[PDB]
Amino acid sequence: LPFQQFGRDIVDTTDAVRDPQTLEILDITPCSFGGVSVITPGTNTSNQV
Amino acid sequence: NGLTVLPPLLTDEMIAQYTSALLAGTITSGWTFGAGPALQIPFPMQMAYR
Ligand SMILES: *[C@@H]1O[C@H](CO)[C@@H](O)[C@H](O)[C@H]1NC(C)=O
């Protein structure tokens, strides 16, 4: 609507903003992350991972 | 934020295969496949013992 500024989701995290200069809404998505796991045979066998 | 979800090791398409194997073993063999080699028996002859 022509008077809101931000946006929010069910858990109250910002997920949309409107640009001040040009009145347009920009969706926001966080940068990538995740866990890291290493697969290895026994050091008695090899050293590749 | 730092909260991931890991997928299961066995997919649904494999659990379905286990279920189908169990059914096919309990239809054409009775209870004999749970104690050793699976042996044939006709179904109206299994239900007689049951
Ligand atoms: C801000 O300046 C830019 C550059 O001329 C212009 O295009 C824009 O319309 C201006 N903002 C508003 C709200 O008019």
From Swiss-Prot, chain A:
Glycans are attached at N44. Attaches the virion to the cell membrane by interacting with host receptor, initiating the infection. The major receptor is host ACE2. When S2/S2' has been cleaved, binding to the receptor triggers direct fusion at the cell membrane. When S2/S2' has not been cleaved, binding to the receptor results in internalization of the virus by endocytosis using host TFRC and GRM2 and leading to fusion of the virion membrane with the host endosomal membrane. Alternatively, may use NRP1/NRP2 and integrin as entry receptors. Binds to host ACE2. RBD also interacts with the N-linked glycan on 'Asn-90' of ACE2. Cleavage of S generates a polybasic C-terminal sequence on S1 that binds to host Neuropilin-1 (NRP1) and Neuropilin-2 (NRP2) receptors. Interacts with host integrin alpha-5/beta-1 (ITGA5:ITGB1) and with ACE2 in complex with integrin alpha-5/beta-1 (ITGA5:ITGB1). May interact via cytoplasmic c-terminus with M protein. May interact (via N-terminus) with host bilirubin and biliverdin, thereby preventing antibody binding to the SARS-CoV-2 spike NTD via an allosteric mechanism. This is Spike protein S1. The lineage of its organism: Viruses, Riboviria, Orthornavirae, Pisuviricota, Pisoniviricetes. The gene is S. The chain holds residues 560 to 608 of 1273 of the full protein.
